[PDB]
């Protein structure tokens with residue numbers, strides 16, 4: 001259940017944290033980029049596999065802010081990852097996934113792939129672990145990237161910073177990207193960004 005990062009991964013992380021201190025908001029582009037890629041794979045999978053889109057019927061990317069908990073979630077209904085995939089793809093080696101540590105003290109990755117049960121991968125960057133999601137299969141199919149934001153990144157909880165950023169990066173993504181926001185006597189609901 002517990003693992004150490006490959007030596008190259010530790011170097012990547014430090015290198016990222018050091019050569020990108022200026023453009024931290026880049027993390028959201030990378031994550032939105034990975035969602036889009038996971039959505040292409042299931043889509044390609046659904047060409048020769050009529051069952052492939054069973055666990056979930058939609059192909060989207062939904063982002064929600066949670067202040068009280070200090071969290072930021074990025075969920076896609078792409079191919080998702082198996083337990084073995086979470087361990088190889090996120091523990092061994094275009095900034096990438098680890099750009100998530102530019103704004104987070106902790107990174108959690110919940111993922112459900114058609115060929116396995118929903119798991120959770122977690123890391124504070126000094127090590128990581130994969131466990132079976134005791135909450136069962138709640139995603140259907142896909143991945144949720146949850147970031148435990150650092151103190152200085154708290155401005156990424158404000159729905160306006162997220163929206164401005166999401167629109168820029170949701171420009172070339174051929175999939176609907178929503179942001180759970182509010183309206184005015186104030187109800188919360190998804191808001192398409194692209």
Ligand SMILES: Nc1ncnc2c1ncn2[C@@H]1O[C@H](COP(=O)(O)OP(=O)(O)O)[C@@H](O)[C@H]1O
Nearest residue numbers: 034035038076078080081089090096097098143
């Ligand atoms: N949202 C996601 N859904 C499925 N797989 C993902 C997701 N995010 C990351 N991955 C996996 O992690 C791997 C490494 O991600 P990343 O660092 O962005 O490099 P890249 O996307 O260039 O391969 C991806 O190739 C993919 O296998």
Ligand SMILES: [Mg+2]
Nearest residue numbers: 033034096097
């Ligand atoms: Mg990428």
